Design a protein around this ligand. Structure first.
Ligand SMILES: NC(=O)c1ccc[n+]([C@@H]2O[C@H](COP(=O)(O)O)[C@@H](O)[C@H]2O)c1
Ligand SMILES: COc1nc2nc(N)nc(N)c2nc1C
Ligand SMILES: COc1nc2nc(N)nc(N)c2nc1C
Lengths: 275, 281
């Protein structure tokens, strides 16, 4: 134990497989090919976003929110175009990485997710916490990957989002390890530790998770609209794809009383870019 | 406005003081001048605790420690106990808002304390700011290390003021007088033991590590014990090495470790039912 606690590791790990370290750098490199994925039932339901296609619909959301909240502050984030995932930590160790699936049942892809270098294997405190976000492939890497799909006699990936989702849904961990996939976490799925979405993001960063930094707090739809317009202009130059901007009521208690439909928060909407 | 942040973060000084003396209502929260001699007060402002302090039931013998473990096991079949030192010091509550220390307060009558915020700023171990913008109240003891006490007493002697009887008199004496510059010269320190605002972690032990992440000093001298017998060994070893500790202690506080368990036992009128302090002489 004290052995591994401090190429040698590999030998010791293949010897007593019954006792690899959670923090082992060995989980970042090629491991097993898996049978299939187990199905996993989500402890906390992974809801969806209501969509908006126009400034008027954003006006309409804002008016619906101010039916219950007098002075809302909104946080507008990017909607990353990738594969949506959920990560469960127990005692500060990542135990289950799972696809959103239908919002109730997903595929347990935990082994595959350990080879996304951005994902923390352990946390700095002994937490139980479930986080959500999107796993994706940078535009930079896409061209390379698609060359590798051809040389292996497989269909090229239609775009980065498909390349990431098809990487995480195939069965060989060692393939995940050779593509450079990354993450942006946007939320706790387990009850929020902090008072505000903007504080949750800063907290998640304190835990070791990558949080997307292009985001603002805004008081009205006019400030929001500009940010969506600045996003629309810069988006050819981002190093990942997006498919929109998410606007949320910042404060937890405000979100609380707005509540949820059977599908989505009442306190959030997702703007979608024209074609 | 901007030379400030640059000057404060670099320095983290001559100019800075000058700008600060120029524009007093823009001295930044983590300015290093908060550590140095500053204002004198005329008297302390009152402050009403948002979370009032309670007290501790006490025990004075092994038998009594056993009766405690028995009352606890009426409710929780398999308790874990955390065992901590009860430091001989002065009780402080520290309230942060937006990550900044905004009040430091004495126990007072339990609902209303004395605002000693400026004096506490000169205690170096206390963070002026946190690594996130939290609203949080933390509660601990401010004490004087025995080594400082022996220095300060030598200083008072050469300056012909009378010596403090013990580190506890010395600590209450420094913090309760009105000159921040006296606090700065005297080398006080802290150990925090709880969140006074509602716990963020689900065990005392996870609670303690959490505070350490936030920049607070926490006494390493503790254990997680599964029955009165490891507890009693720990206290005996503590009694024995007591003379060799860098600070004075008033005993051992034994607490039911996990929050759900503390919540099921609850409190009497004045005190938790989930905690006891064993008193040494
Ligand atoms: N201005 C402050 O020092 C202040 C106050 C509250 C939170 N924070 C957060 O902490 C960071 C600075 O580090 P520390 O406060 O841990 O020294 C800031 O960049 C900020 O995000 C800072
Ligand atoms: C509040 O719920 C959500 N918030 C989100 N935020 C970002 N940035 N991206 C998402 N995909 C997202 N999805 C959901 C369901
Ligand atoms: C459970 O409440 C308490 N716990 C404590 N813990 C330690 N270590 N020291 C104290 N002085 C203390 N005081 C109280 C009221």
């Amino acid at each position: 134990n004290k052995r591994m606690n401090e190429r040698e590791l590999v030998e010791l790990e293949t010897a007593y497989p019954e006792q690899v370290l959670a923090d082992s750098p060995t989980h970042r490199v090629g491991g097993k090919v898996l049978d299939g994925f187990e199905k996993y039932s989500h402890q906390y339901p992974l809801y969806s976003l209501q969509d908006a296609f126009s400034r008027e619909e954003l006006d309409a959301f804002d008016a619906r929110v101010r039916k219950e909240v007098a002075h809302p502050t909104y946080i507008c984030e990017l909607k990353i175009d990738g594969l949506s995932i959920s990560l469960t930590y127990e005692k500060g160790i990542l135990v289950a990485g799972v696809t959103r699936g239908d919002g109730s049942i997903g595929e347990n892809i935990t082994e595959n997710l350990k080879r996304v270098k951005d994902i923390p294997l352990t946390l700095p405190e002994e937490l139980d916490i479930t986080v959500r976000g999107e796993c994706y492939m940078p535009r930079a890497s896409f061209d390379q990957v698609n060359q590798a799909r051809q040389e292996n006699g497989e269909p090229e990936f239609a775009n980065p989002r498909n390349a990431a989702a098809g990487t995480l849904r195939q069965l060989d961990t060692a393939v995940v390890a050779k593509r450079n996939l990354a993450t942006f976490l946007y939320q706790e799925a387990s009850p929020s530790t902090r008072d505000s979405q903007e504080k949750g993001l800063k907290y998640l960063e304190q835990l070791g998770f990558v949080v997307n930094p292009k985001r603002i707090l805004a008081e009205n739809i006019d400030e929001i609209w500009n940010f969506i317009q600045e996003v629309g202009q810069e988006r050819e130059n981002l190093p990942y794809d997006i498919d929109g901007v998410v606007i949320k009521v910042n404060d937890l208690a405000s979100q609380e009383e707005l509540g949820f439909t059977v599908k989505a928060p009442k306190w959030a909407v997702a703007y979608k870019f024209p074609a």
